[PDB]
Structure formats: structure tokens, C-alpha cells
Write an enzyme that holds these catalytic residues in place. Structure first.
Site, short mmCIF file in Angstrom:
data_model
loop_
_atom_site.label_atom_id
_atom_site.label_comp_id
_atom_site.label_asym_id
_atom_site.label_seq_id
_atom_site.Cartn_x
_atom_site.Cartn_y
_atom_site.Cartn_z
N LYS A 1 0.85 -1.20 0.00
CA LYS A 1 0.00 0.00 0.00
C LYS A 1 0.88 1.24 0.00
O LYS A 1 1.71 1.45 0.89
CB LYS A 1 -0.96 -0.02 1.19
N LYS B 1 -2.23 -1.63 -3.68
CA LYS B 1 -3.03 -0.40 -3.61
C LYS B 1 -2.15 0.83 -3.63
O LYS B 1 -1.19 0.92 -2.83
CB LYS B 1 -3.89 -0.44 -2.34
C1 LIG Z 1 -7.45 2.75 1.61
O1 LIG Z 1 -6.31 3.70 1.64
C2 LIG Z 1 -8.70 3.41 1.10
C3 LIG Z 1 -9.19 3.03 -0.27
C4 LIG Z 1 -9.69 4.17 -1.14
O2 LIG Z 1 -9.18 5.31 -0.99
O3 LIG Z 1 -10.58 4.02 -2.00
C5 LIG Z 1 -7.50 2.05 2.97
C6 LIG Z 1 -7.98 3.00 4.05
N1 LIG Z 1 -8.32 0.81 2.93
ZN LIG Z 2 -5.73 3.09 8.35
#
Ligand SMILES: *[C@@](O)(CCC(=O)O)[C@@H](C)N
Ligand SMILES: [Zn+2]
Ligand SMILES: *[C@@](O)(CCC(=O)O)[C@@H](C)N
Ligand SMILES: *[C@@](O)(CCC(=O)O)[C@@H](C)N
Ligand SMILES: *[C@@](O)(CCC(=O)O)[C@@H](C)N
Ligand SMILES: [Zn+2]
Ligand SMILES: [Zn+2]
Lengths: 340, 147, 340, 340
Positions: free
Chosen positions: C210, C263
Site C-alpha cells: 500500500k 493499492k
Molecule cells: C485505503 O487507503 C482506502 C481506499 C480508497 O481510498 O478508495 C484504505 C484506508 N483501505
Molecule cells: Zn488506516
């Protein structure tokens, strides 16, 4: 007139020509990376707790459930023709034997340990493998000890299985083959054997990649091992689960396995090829399961294939894919065929 | 005359058949003959006919001899005569030959490959998935397997 | 006159000719190593602690914050069209709920556990994933528990997160997805589940890679999760940090992850490709984040791209790069589009 | 009271701790395997055949179509701020210029060769790249010469393209960048340059992995290169076609490419990572295409992202994925930003 058209062609490239390697019967043997021999064969025995049993198992052609007082006459011609190893399955039919913790799995009076003792005395050169699981001994028919919600209890199951495996070894088995698929049971069985001073004598043959599916039909009639409420799909691997299988192979190796079994066999040949890389320093064993065996017989009796031919094709298939050992219900046929 | 396959004349005839099917409208040609170097000749054929940019070449690159083609021999009335198919179809134990055949057919122009039979040769599909990782791989569930 | 010059050319080399593989609509499908299906889709739900909420989130088009008494009517047409999985985010808006240790993260009265209970009863076949973090529940808005100097306290954070994850599992979640990025939290969550007798039932879907960056804008308006003093750049990975990402993927696998999330998605497709080798035996999930989603809508409304088209292009992009799962705000559109 | 639960945890494993590598602004730079510098930037120029042109291209923000008599004043501040390379696209608007064989592609009076001559004289240190294709010069708008059935004629197309490329080199271009994707054109262009005694002077920058898709919208308005009857999907690669892309990369390397371009960029970062292994000894170039660029502007003007921020994020993304060169419409912004 429509006539036969021949396109203008260029001289043959040497890189195209494979045919020089397989144009004679001996060459088709040279091309095998491993040839089938008798000592690769492992024959399952279903031992009854009725010592005079010799009951044919309907769904599993030419295979019987056998009691100890019938074993000498049955094994004698087989050992004489070159049989080197057997894998024992217990089928206790006396009532009130099965319970929730598979107490009878290692009953010294039960068919497996009685069978070990008989074989060790009457056929002292035979290599004895025992299936290790609880499903033929549990009242629910599942392979491990269950929580109340019918799910498997890992810790209690591996503790019980380690005991069963060590007790078979104590009784004389040379090899234990845990078929339960419960997470981490190889570690616990190996530690068990170490603590019992038997790990230097006992081969651990893990069913590392055992899949759930439709090919165990007739087994459920020879060893009377049927589940109850739910299915085996939460510990047996899903048929599509290559990633899980690769991780299971690595895990069981790490935890002490001396060899591994892939089951079923023909329908999972790609997983044997995967195991041949992951487990390249270990013996790999194919288990030609009840449904696969019965499928070959069904097709042969319908005229679709020749039984001997497709026997050789499928079993050479195991060797091609990387196995060097085969558990098969056709071992008696092969002990004759490999002579010819 | 001695009943052995004539490579040069066979690949010449096969290249023509493949190009003519393409000329008639087939999108894809799938050479099942296993004769050494036929993919090269078929691809060159299509190139010369201005059809290689339209015609997928789906080679039966790993086709094995064996006991699983029984009922096919009754649907397409394709039975040999004197000798067997074991001199061009691969021997069932022949993994090394299969791996070389896969590499060869790729080299010679195959857009995709077929492994045949299927279930009884799943390990060869796994071999092909590495050797032919950038190409579509096709399984042929053959007559004997189906029956 | 300037005329069109044509150089003398040599015959075509077979090695040059790729075109035979993609000259027909069906072939462009054959060329995909993975096709998009409905069951790959995971749809986020933002659950309010006002049970009658159905509030549109300005910056996140067509997405609402929803209370439990509005969930049946919202999920019904989605499940009917093939929705298989949801990922829950809690948005408690009642005052005095947030505190420095994220006490409310696992409040049995809070929106996540209320949402788990509702879904388990009303949509018993839906697979429930819960985001696991503290940032929607902390007064400072950061993802972990802080030292006085505002830095994250690793030990106390992973202890708190392991509890939250286990408590969601206890309440009924099938899957926990730790999004905190704090060093070693997967180990602690897995051990937590093991100790609770839930590890054999609970998929651990780590947000292993992430990244920090500019693509989370509108998320900060739907879940009211804004930091405070400092930034997320000390635990979220730096966008240039491929080496850190590769090590994080290896770490989380080692510590028990059953699957991994990358992500954001489109802007990190190379990291999905990295994960497909490092985590080849595990499911890989792409998270099409708020900023990426809103970017597609903005461009489509400006006439730069076609929304459906670029939806398919980007989401097929995830599959090409190695993902087999997608968390996306366009799941409702795809449940219709994949019909056509 | 619901209170904050903290699970009992074990001492930190050293293997879990990544944070020591990225807790300071300088470290987030240390973690980059490649830093963005000015000389990595390549700026496209759209040269008009109206020498006094300076026409803004609606759909492509801040970018104009420019005639030769406007080029000095436009390029002067850019070169002064560090611009090292440009890639030329010809946009002939005089009627009766386009024909079926793209005769005007290498017209010595046309905008590309006029632009080469001007640049070589007025900015003798600028490195000149020319796009090589026929689509801005064909009456049908396709990239090659067509058969009657509207399909591309490979042999005639590569013959025509080899000539265009050699003629640009003859006129003074340092680098030719074939964007046609027609099978085997690199071989023919390289042989062309060899025969012209220019291969030791001319870099061949192949668009080896150029995908069909929805991201070329505004390009079709700046270079007036729109197809006609059919689509580009029979030579441009299908977006799902990783296998085809990997083979195209290998092919173009084999046929003489000195460098390769992946196009589009952000939505194909996984293919850059693939190219970084296949083409590890060659420069890899990212093309931030019209639709990607316009998408960033659209989102920024809608408040979804910050333009400079997401510019840096996406362009650092290219470098992370393995590119060392970038063709981008944001080069003027970066020549300022990389100062700061
Ligand atoms: C994520 O950073 C959020 C997803 C989005 O921005 O659509 C974490 C908080 N799951
Ligand atoms: Zn968080
Ligand atoms: C196995 O599933 C049975 C083999 C067979 O069905 O033939 C386990 C119980 N060893
Ligand atoms: C193949 O051997 C036949 C397939 C089948 O038996 O089903 C060749 C002839 N395509
Ligand atoms: C490319 O497709 C155009 C780049 C862009 O759209 O910005 C070829 C024509 N170089
Ligand atoms: Zn069992
Ligand atoms: Zn073009």
C-alpha cells in the site's frame, strides 16, 4: 479435375528433424526418463477385523477385504512374483469400535497392528507402509477430531495422529503415510518419532497433495470410510488449487517428509510435475485411486480401451511426470506383466 | 514405397491443404500430422498467399501415440494400414521429444499449441506452459478420454 | 515530383509475424491470460452508525454512506446480479466515539460488527471482508497507536490491531484485511486468529503493498479518515519504493497472509507484476482506489475517455499484471456489463 | 463499557521491521532505484505545414501545432531550461497532400524534414527523434499501405516505412521511432539504414509494445490522424495481450532496436516491468500519451488530484517500473519543477 497441389518447399532444416530419435521399438524405451520396475510398486491391503475375512469389494474389481488368517495364502504368490511393499488400511467392522476420537486407530488388537505383526513375522522382507488417519475409525467418518460445530480441531487432531503414527512404528511399520491433510501434522508426527527414538528407522511418506473430488467412490465401500455432515473440501485441496498444492508440498518437506504422495494421479499429473521441482531431492509417489482404477476397468469392459494397454499408458504417465513410486490396485497384474 | 512417411512430399501437400482451407475462409488451421517441420512450410505457405496476418496456426505440437483414440477411428473413418502411428506420434514416455516439439513448432510460426490427449498428459501441458508461456495452450479431450 | 519511395526488401522472416494471433475478436480474448468474471469483484461498503443513513459521498460518484436499516434494499439487486463479496468500512459519526486507542474499532454496537451481523443473516451466501485498521476510529486519524512524539508505536498498535481483527472474525467476518501497513502486524493477527481457533476459517488478505500518494482524496470524505500532524509517508510505502514493496510482499506471505492487495492499482501495475512472482501461489487483489475511480469519472465527463471503455481497459489491466481479484467502486456497473 | 482490547504479543521479529529504511525525506530518495533528471525528458512537437502556425490543440492542454517560423521562439526558453530531446510529428494540412501510399511522409518540403533542418541549424545540440509512420499522411488514415480489402499489406508497408525512416536520417534526424507496429518493420528499417551508411549514427527507438485502446483521443485532434473503415486493433496490441507484447519486445530487439517504447504508460506499467527483463540491456522509454495527460488535467481541474503531485507520482512510476526515458507533454512543467 481437382488435382493434388504441392507447394514449393525449402530444404529441410536440421532443427525440424526429431524423427531420428524414435523410429525403433528400443528407442521408444531410450526416450523414457524412467522405466517401470517391480520394486516401484506398492499394493494396498484392506485388513478386516474378522480374521477369516476374504470379502470382495463390489466397486473395486478384483480387490478384497482380508483378515489375518487369510493373508499368508494371498500374499505368498505376490511376494514370490516380486512384490516389495504394501500399504495397510484398517477396516474394523466389529460394532462399537468407532468413536469421536478414533480410539481404535492404534488398538493393538485392531487389524493394522495385527497385520503389521503377521507381516513382520511371515514376510520379514516385505516393506510395510501404514496409512495414518482417523476416518476409518471415527463415528463421524471425518479424518480428524472435531470441534462441536463439526469443523476439524487442528491441535487435537495432530496430537492424536502423531500418536497413531508412532504406535504403528512401535508395532513394526517401516513407513507411516499420513493421509489426513490437516495443517502441520507432519511436524507433529516427525517430532513424535524423534521423541520415540524411531525417526532414524521410519520413513515419513506424506500425502502432501491430496485433492478433494469425484474419484474416491469405490474406496468408500472398501474401507467403510464415509464422512458425515459437511464434506472433505475444507482440508482436502480444491481441484483448481495449484498454489495451495505447491505450498503444501513445500510445507511437508520442511516439516520432515522423506517422500511425498500425489493423489489422485492421472487427473493430477501436472501436480506431480510441480512436485518434481519443489521436491526434487525426495521420492515422489503416485496414488492410482479407486475411482481412477474402476474407471479404467469400466472403459475396458465397454471396449473403449484395452486394460493392459491403458494400464501401461497411465502408469508410464506417472513416471514421465516425475513419480518414481506407484500405489496401485493393478500391482498384481504388473507383477506378471513386467515379466513379459 | 516402403510405407514410411516421405517428409518433403508430405509437408508440401499439407502446406497446400492448409493454405487452401484459409483461402476458402477458415480462420485457423490446426495441423495434426506431427510430421517434422510441417509448421514452417505451412507458415511460409500462408505468407506467400498473403494470409499469414489473418490465419491462426494452432499446431498439435505435442500429440502422443496411444490407446485413447479408439472411437475417433469410427467417426472420421481414419484408420491406418500396415504399421502404426508410433513413428510420428510421440511415444507416451517421450517428455524430451515433446519439449523439443513444442520449442520447434513455436520457432516455426505456431500462434498456439495443442496438447493431445489431455487428462493423461497434464504434465505436458505444465511443460508447455513454461516453454510456450507467451502462446495460447489448448487441451484436446480426445475420443477415448470422453468415452 | 516528390514520389513515394519503396526500399528493396527481403522475404518475410517467420519470426517477425505475430499478426496471425490477434486478427479476430475471439482471438483478442484467447490472448488474455485471465478473463474478467463476476466472482472476482469485491465491492466496498461504507457503513454509518446512523442506521437510516443513505448519504451520497460528494467526491466519490454514485457511492453512499449507508446505515444498516438501508442495507437490504441496497444489496438486494446487487446480490441478485451476481455480487459475491463486499469489504466493509466503518464510518462512526456519533460524537465522542473516536479516541487515541481506537476503542470503537471493534465496538459490538458499531457499524462494522452490526453490518457483519445483518449481512450474515440477510445475505448468508455473501462473503464478508472487513478492513482492519484504526484510522477511522482514532482521534488523531492515524492508522496505529501513537507514542507521545506522534510517531507510531509498533507493539501497541499491532496488539490493538490483532484484537480488532480477531473480534471481527468472532462476529462473523470471513476475511480480515489489515490496511495499516505497520511492521509485523500480519504475524500478530495470524497468531491472534490461531489462539482464537479461527485461523482455519479466516482468510488473511493483507494490504501488503500500500503506497502513500495523491490518489486517496475522495476516500478521506467517505470514511472521514483524515490524519493529523505529520503524514502517512512513514508507514505507507514511498511511491518509488519497489525494494520496500518486494520485501513487504515477502514478509506478509511469511507471516501468514492467504492473499495480498496492491493499492493503488493502475498507477502500481508493475508492483502487481512483481507480486505475481513473489506471491505466485497466493491470490493477488487490486484495489481501484477512490482517486483512481474519481479520475476515470472526471476524464469521462470531460470527454477524454468513454467510462465503460476505460473501465474495461483499466480493470483488464489488473488481470494482465497478475491480479485475480479486484476491489472496485465500479462493481455495480460490471455486474451489468459482464452480462452483455 | 466496551473497552480497548490488546492481545498478548511476542517480541518483534527483526524480519518484520522495514521502517528503518524510509523514515526521513532523504531516505525516500535513497529508496528510488532511478531518480528523475532533465535529460530523461523527450518533448513531442507537432509541426504544421503552415510555417506561421501556432494553433492550440483543444483537447491537448497547453500544446500547440506549430510552423517552422514559430519554432525558434518556442524552443528557446525550453532548451535554455535544459531540454535535451524532441520527437517530431508532422501535421500537413495543405489539401491534396494525403494519398494511399503516404507519399508526403518524406516530402523534403514537408514539416518533418523542414523541422529537422531548422532544428539542426538553430539548435545544433538538440537530439532529434522522428516518429516514423504513414498514418498522418495516408488518405485512409491507417498506419500502413492497404490491400484492397482494407487490410494492411505487410511487405509494401515495411518497404515504404524503411524508406521514410532512412530519408529522415538522411535529412538529419538522429533517431527514428517507428510507431506503426507492422510485423517485421524494424528489420527492414535497420537494413535500410545499413545500406545507407547511417546505421552507426541512427538510434532505432521502436514502439515495440504499443497497445490499442481508449487513451489516444486528443492525439487524433493534434495530428489529424484518424483511421477509416475498421480499427487499429489488428496491428496495435490488444490490451490483454501480455504474451504478444513480450514476443514483440523480443522480436524488435532481435531485429535491431537500440531502445524500446512502451505506449501507453501508466495503464501499462506491468509491461514496462516485463520489458525491463526482456530488454535489460536496452534503454526503455515510457510514452505518456494524450489521453493519459488529458486525464491528469481533467482530474486536477475537478479537484481529484494536484497536477504537480500526480505528475511526479505517475512519472516516478515509469522509472520505478524500469523506464529510463520519458516522452511527455509535461516536459515544460518538469524543466521548471526539477529545478525546485
Ligand atoms: C485505503 O487507503 C482506502 C481506499 C480508497 O481510498 O478508495 C484504505 C484506508 N483501505
Ligand atoms: Zn488506516
Ligand atoms: C485415499 O483417499 C484413498 C485411496 C483410494 O480411494 O483408492 C486415502 C483415504 N488414503
Ligand atoms: C486426433 O488424433 C483425433 C481426436 C480424437 O480422437 O478425438 C486427430 C486426428 N485430430
Ligand atoms: C501515438 O499513438 C500517439 C501518442 C499520443 O497519443 O499522445 C503514435 C501515433 N506515436
Ligand atoms: Zn482420512
Ligand atoms: Zn501510425
Amino acid at each position: 479435375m481437382h488435382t493434388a497441389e504441392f507447394l514449393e518447399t525449402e530444404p529441410t532444416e536440421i532443427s525440424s528433424v526429431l524423427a531420428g530419435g524414435y523410429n525403433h521399438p528400443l528407442l521408444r524405451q531410450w526416450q523414457s526418463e524412467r522405466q517401470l520396475t517391480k520394486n516401484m510398486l506398492i499394493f494396498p491391503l484392506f485388513i478386516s477385523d474378522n480374521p477369516d475375512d476374504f470379502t470382495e469389494i463390489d466397486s473395486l474389481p478384483n480387490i478384497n477385504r482380508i483378515g489375518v488368517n487369510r493373508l499368508k495364502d494371498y500374499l505368498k504368490p505376490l511376494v514370490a512374483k516380486g512384490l516389495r511393499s504394501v500399504i495397510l488400511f484398517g477396516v474394523p467392522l466389529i460394532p462399537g469400535t468407532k468413536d469421536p476420537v478414533g480410539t481404535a486407530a492404534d488398538d493393538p488388537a485392531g487389524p493394522v497392528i495385527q497385520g503389521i505383526k503377521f507381516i513382520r513375522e511371515y514376510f520379514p522382507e516385505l516393506y510395510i507402509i501404514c496409512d495414518v488417519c482417523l476416518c476409518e475409525y471415527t463415528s463421524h467418518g471425518h479424518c480428524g477430531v472435531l470441534y462441536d460445530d463439526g469443523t476439524i480441531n487442528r491441535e487435537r487432531s495432530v496430537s492424536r495422529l502423531a500418536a497413531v503414527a508412532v504406535n504403528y512404528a512401535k508395532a513394526g511399520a517401516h513407513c507411516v503415510a499420513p493421509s489426513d491433510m490437516i495443517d502441520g501434522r507432519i511436524r507433529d508426527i516427525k517430532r513424535g518419532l524423534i521423541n520415540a527414538n524411531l525417526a532414524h528407522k521410519t520413513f515419513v511418506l506424506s500425502y502432501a497433495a491430496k485433492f478433494s473430488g469425484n474419484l474416491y467412490g469405490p474406496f468408500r465401500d472398501a474401507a467403510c470410510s464415509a464422512p458425515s455432515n459437511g464434506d472433505r473440501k475444507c482440508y482436502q485441496l480444491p481441484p483448481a488449487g495449484r498454489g495451495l498444492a505447491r505450498r503444501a508440498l513445500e510445507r511437508d518437506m520442511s516439516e520432515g517428509a522423506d517422500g511425498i504422495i500425489v493423489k489422485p494421479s492421472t487427473f493430477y499429473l501436472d501436480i506431480m510435475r510441480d512436485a518434481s521441482e519443489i521436491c526434487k531431492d525426495l521420492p515422489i509417489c503416485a496414488y492410482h485411486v479407486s475411482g481412477e482404477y474402476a474407471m479404467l476397468h469400466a472403459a475396458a469392459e465397454k471396449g473403449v480401451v484395452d486394460l493392459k494397454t491403458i494400464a501401461f499408458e497411465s502408469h508410464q504417465g506417472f513416471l514421465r511426470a516425475g513419480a518414481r513410486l506407484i500405489i496401485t490396485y493393478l500391482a498384481p497384474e504388473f507383477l506378471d506383466w513386467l515379466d513379459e
